[PDB]
């Protein structure tokens, strides 16, 4: 019973680790196009601010 609970705990922990890692990887992949768009907008603003200064 101790070995069974230890195996079930290890499997639950391993499944939790994978879920968190895959969730963060998925969030980052969906964020890439937004980061690129935000970089283009920031580059325009920095260029306008430089020209104005």
């Amino acid at each position: 019973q101790l070995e069974k609970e230890k195996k079930e705990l290890q499997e639950r922990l391993k499944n939790q680790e994978k879920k968190i890692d895959y969730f963060e990887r998925a969030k980052r992949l969906e964020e890439i196009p937004l980061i690129k768009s935000a970089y283009e907008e920031q580059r325009i603003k920095d260029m306008d601010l430089w020209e104005q200064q």
Binding site: Q16, E24, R25, I32, A38
Partner: protein, 491 residues
């Protein structure tokens, strides 16, 4: 930062930021198998190296002027001439840099707190020197709209964009022992002990109105500590009260609620010697440590479905002195920092259950992934000198590696905030409802399984043939002359 995170092949984690390997300030990834070194740059900093809040710039100390190292392959794009400086820190929105000289020169005269605007590249202000207390002595608001410092008899409030003086005034309030800005727009929590005619109080003040919106007198207190929740939802105050025997007899927790009408107050706790408190990141649970039992006791608190926040679990007494929570809320580290052994214990939450307990010989320093996957802990050579190392570990209870480092100075992860967050992303996180899922990780492991093939096979065969040759000689030698083969000279 974001681009590199997409393009680069691995599998699967964070970027550093290492002081230690060699006489060099050095760049690494987290490639699961090892951290792989990207660069090692000889004498890049002359004291300490600091990241910008999104990791955008690297702030590098040179004794002839602080430098902001930018561009993908790293060069100085901006450098600020202030010597005698040791403190070199940003506004939380990456727009302004504050430099402080605790060593007077004729650089400061006597304007030792110098504020540099990153967007222009110019010194906007200097403010004359300081004696008290912990850095930051001059504290920004979350938006970077306001900036302030205490005079003991008067709070002075300074204003972005030009670093003016708010209302053309400073707020004549006396006896302040510390002040903390809210994450929420825009509020200061500050507190006053027994000052002559005035009994002790905690004040919540709104700005730019400048009104003491919630004051509570606390009465006869040795000390208090003001702990904001990370979104500004709550202010917890940790209050140590005094009987007529002149003792710190009992710690109380009193929680102000800031979204709720007319700022109601949850009085929660009464207990012996509370030495640490920490909120759940982005949430509403909390964990607490109590002294003198004679090992340190741990108490765990959750929010009830009927309202109030209340004790829910405890665990037996331990060596943990520092409570360090994951940015993803679930995992909390209970760490006995500055102990020779053990002393790192790991708890999964809701309903606080201990997952693992591990080594880190002479542990000093501790940090997490911004999304909670990895823990890194280190032993600075400024702190300790019997092992000197960094230790890298996965949230589960699996060590990745421990790498001893010869005169180890520092480790810091490069910041990586989640780029956007929304109701549909929060919905996608709930999609598989709770049971298991099998959509992503099995495909990444299949990709890794593909990475064992095509020219790879001949090399796998070579590795194998070598291990076999070696086992054969290993056997023979044990039998013939009782000798154990090795690849490095034993201790």
């Amino acid at each position: 930062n974001l681009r590199y995170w997409l393009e680069e092949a691995e599998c699967r984690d964070q970027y550093s930021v290492i002081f230690e390997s060699g006489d060099r300030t050095s760049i690494f990834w987290n490639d699961v198998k090892d951290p792989v070194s990207i660069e090692e740059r000889a004498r890049w900093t002359e004291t300490y190296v600091r990241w910008s809040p999104k990791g955008t710039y690297l702030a590098t100390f040179h004794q002839r002027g602080i430098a902001l190292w930018g561009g993908e392959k790293f060069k100085q794009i901006q450098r600020f001439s202030h010597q005698g400086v040791q403190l070199i820190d940003f506004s939380p929105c990456e727009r302004y840099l504050v430099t402080f000289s605790p060593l007077m020169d004729t650089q400061d005269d006597p304007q030792a707190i110098i504020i540099w605007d990153i967007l222009t590249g110019h010194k906007k202000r200097g403010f004359h020197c300081e004696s008290s207390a912990h850095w930051p002595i001059f504290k920004w608001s979350h938006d970077g709209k306001f900036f302030a410092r205490m005079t003991l008899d008067t709070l002075s409030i300074y204003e972005t964009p030009s670093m003016g003086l708010l209302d053309k005034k400073s707020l004549k309030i006396s006896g302040i022992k510390d002040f903390s800005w809210s994450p929420g727009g825009n509020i200061i929590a500050f507190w006053v002990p027994e000052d002559k005619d005035i009994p002790a109080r905690v004040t919540l003040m709104q700005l730019p109105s400048r009104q003491e919106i919630r004051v509570r007198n606390l009465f006869n207190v040795v000390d208090c500590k003001l702990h904001w929740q990370k979104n500004g939802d709550y202010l917890c105050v940790k209050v140590d009260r005094t009987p007529k025997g002149t003792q710190g007899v009992v710690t109380n927790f009193e929680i102000f609620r800031m979204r709720e009408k007319q700022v109601p107050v949850d009085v929660v706790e009464m207990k012996e010697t509370i030495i640490a408190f920490a909120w759940e990141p982005n949430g509403s649970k909390f964990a607490v440590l109590h002294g003198e039992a004679p090992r340190i006791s741990v108490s765990f608190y959750h929010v009830k479905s009927n309202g109030k926040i209340e004790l829910s679990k405890m665990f037996d007494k331990q060596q943990a002195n520092t409570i360090f929570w994951s940015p993803q809320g679930q995992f909390v580290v209970l760490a006995g920092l500055r102990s020779m052994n053990g002393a790192l214990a790991f708890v999964d939450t809701s309903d606080c259950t201990v997952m693992n307990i591990a080594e880190h010989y002479m542990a000093s320093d501790v940090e997490w992934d911004p999304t909670g996957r990895y823990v890194v802990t280190s032993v600075s050579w400024w702190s300790h000198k019997v092992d000197n190392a960094y230790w890298l570990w996965t949230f589960q209870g699996r060590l990745l590696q421990k790498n001893n480092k010869d005169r180890f100075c520092q480790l810091l992860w490069r910041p990586r905030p989640p780029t956007l967050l929304s109701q549909e992303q929060i919905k996608q996180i709930k999609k598989d409802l709770k049971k298991y899922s099998k959509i992503f990780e099995q495909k990444d492991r299949l990709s890794q399984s593909k990475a064992s093939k095509e020219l790879v096979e001949r090399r796998r065969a070579m590795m194998e043939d070598f291990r076999k040759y070696g086992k054969a000689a290993q056997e023979l030698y044990v039998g013939q002359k009782n000798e154990r083969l090795e690849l490095r000279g034993g201790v």
